[PDB]
Design a protein around this ligand. Structure first.
Ligand SMILES: Cc1ccc(C(=O)NCCC2CCCC2)cc1C(=O)Nc1ccc(N)nc1
Length: 285
């Protein structure tokens, strides 16, 4: 229902060289930017002979990306192949490091709460700044999306991609473990149910890529306890304020949950407090 401005977005198919799968494939785009002649990109592609409505599905995903516009923290669209002569393709930037869950998982043995001299001892280590930063960035991207009447409806670490210089992007590739009570029992999807999922995302970030609800069977007994107010315990890498933010996001009443604007504000403050603290840590030792 939204428009497709081909003049701005259309990109020729034989200007792409498809590489390895990631269906979504990595590829070289030739002449997609003003800045570079060759650029690495990610391409979302319809499989041969797929359904009419599967076409429209991918078409809308493209149109939504156009309509919302650019944000640093939502996977940046670069172009599309929509015209006849080949498969429908949607082209974004390539985030070098992949999904956040896996990346945090690889960093388990490379974590320190904060750095001091000699800093080269913790080269490429994750710190609390990184973890709070990733959360701040996703929140800003979600505030952006909520601002435009978007509802992600599957917000999770697996759907967060990591690029250079610790920049994270929101994208979309068992799901129940991220769903709000009302989404499970009423089949309702709102901005506020996205806030629930963000809380679960927070837990993933401050557990360094752990699977939510560890050990627990995901059956109808799981659902009952979620509706009744049972919550995950604090993850191993959390700060007290962070865990309370997770508890805030997991409020039983959707309207009692913080908004994304409030989360942006709060985590920004938590990021500054942590930074100040680290300055003292660094300066005293
Ligand atoms: C190529 C592509 C096209 C579209 C999307 C995508 O997220 N579509 C849904 C858009 C949602 C609508 C609201 C904001 C997110 C993701 C991709 C993608 O998978 N990008 C990607 C994948 C892996 C890596 N490493 N980098 C980029």
């Amino acid at each position: 229902r939204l428009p497709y401005d081909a003049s701005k977005w259309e990109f020729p198919r034989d200007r792409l060289k498809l590489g390895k799968p990631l269906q979504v494939i990595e590829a070289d785009a030739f002449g997609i930017d003003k800045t570079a002649t060759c650029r690495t990109v990610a391409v979302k592609m319809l499989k041969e002979g797929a359904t009419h409505s599967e076409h429209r599905a991918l078409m809308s995903e493209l149109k939504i990306l156009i309509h919302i516009g650019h944000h640093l923290n939502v996977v940046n669209l670069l172009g599309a192949c929509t015209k006849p002569g080949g498969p429908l393709m949607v082209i974004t930037e390539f985030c070098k490091f992949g999904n956040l869950s896996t990346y945090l998982r690889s960093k388990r043995n490379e974590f320190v709460p904060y750095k001091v001299a000699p800093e080269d001892l913790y080269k490429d280590f994750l710190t609390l700044e990184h973890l709070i930063c990733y959360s701040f960035q996703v929140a800003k991207g979600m505030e952006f999306l909520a601002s435009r009447k978007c509802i992600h409806r599957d917000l999770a670490a697996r759907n967060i991609l990591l690029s250079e210089k610790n920049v994270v992007k929101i994208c979309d590739f068992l799901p129940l473990k991220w769903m709000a009570p009302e989404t499970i029992f009423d089949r309702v999807y709102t901005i506020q149910s996205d806030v629930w999922s963000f809380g679960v995302l927070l837990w993933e970030i401050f557990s360094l890529g752990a699977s939510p609800y560890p050990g627990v069977k995901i059956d109808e007994e799981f659902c009952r306890r979620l509706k009744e107010g049972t919550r995950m315990r604090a993850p191993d890498y959390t700060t007290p304020e962070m865990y309370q933010t997770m508890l805030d996001c997991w409020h039983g009443e959707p309207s009692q949950r913080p908004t994304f604007s409030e989360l942006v504000e709060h985590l920004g403050n938590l990021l500054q407090a942590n930074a100040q603290q680290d300055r003292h840590h660094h300066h005293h030792h």
